[PDB]
């Protein structure tokens, strides 16, 4: 009933983790439109490092393309491809 | 090479997802301490509801206890049990 220290420390250490991101977060200039889904699942560096002086940063990145719907008011319904940045590897580095 | 719409929609829709949470956010009366790890993995509601009139909120919660290392000035390195809130179910509900 108690998670042991090494399991917690290893599970929370800097690594790529599926993160749910709002599309307006990645592309603020498109806040004028409506997307469906409004958020997408992306692999992004997350977790903590052994020291507050370090930070979890990506060391390998790539683009992933998803089928997203977008619609402007009183206008036709569009479906197309949208690219998002994904993090493939992460490391604790000086900030 | 493209994630299909239904796949994106299902995976991004409001549900409990492994989130990495800083301990200080969860224990604000202990911001004096240094914790190791400084963050923990917890199940928390995430994703979108695909309607600005709705938000993703927890409807069922439970506790989980983890071994965390703790230290503060005038004290040595301790290891202790700390309980955290988890989300077992989420639903989309008016704002």
């Amino acid at each position: 009933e108690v998670v042991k220290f090494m399991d917690v420390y290893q599970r929370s250490y800097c690594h790529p983790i599926e993160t749910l991101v709002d599309i307006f977060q990645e592309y603020p200039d498109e806040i004028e439109y409506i997307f469906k889904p409004s958020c997408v699942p992306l692999m992004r560096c997350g977790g903590c490092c052994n020291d507050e002086g370090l930070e979890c940063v990506p060391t390998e990145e790539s683009n992933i393309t998803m089928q997203i719907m977008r619609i402007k008011p009183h206008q036709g319904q569009h479906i197309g491809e949208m690219s998002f940045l994904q993090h493939n590897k992460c490391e604790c580095r000086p900030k | 090479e493209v994630v299909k719409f239904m796949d994106v929609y299902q995976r991004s829709y409001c549900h409990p997802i492994e989130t990495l949470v800083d301990i200080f956010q969860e224990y604000p009366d202990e911001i004096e301490y240094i914790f190791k790890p400084s963050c923990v993995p917890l199940m928390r509601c995430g994703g979108c509801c695909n309607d600005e009139g709705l938000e993703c909120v927890p409807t069922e919660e439970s506790n989980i206890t983890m071994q965390i290392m703790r230290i503060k000035p005038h004290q040595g390195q301790h290891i202790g049990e700390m309980s955290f809130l988890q989300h077992n179910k989420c639903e989309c509900r008016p704002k």
Partner: peptide, 14 residues
Amino acid sequence: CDIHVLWEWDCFEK
């Protein structure tokens, strides 16, 4: 026990 890498147990206890 380098600080930029994931630790094992002994890094914590000693």
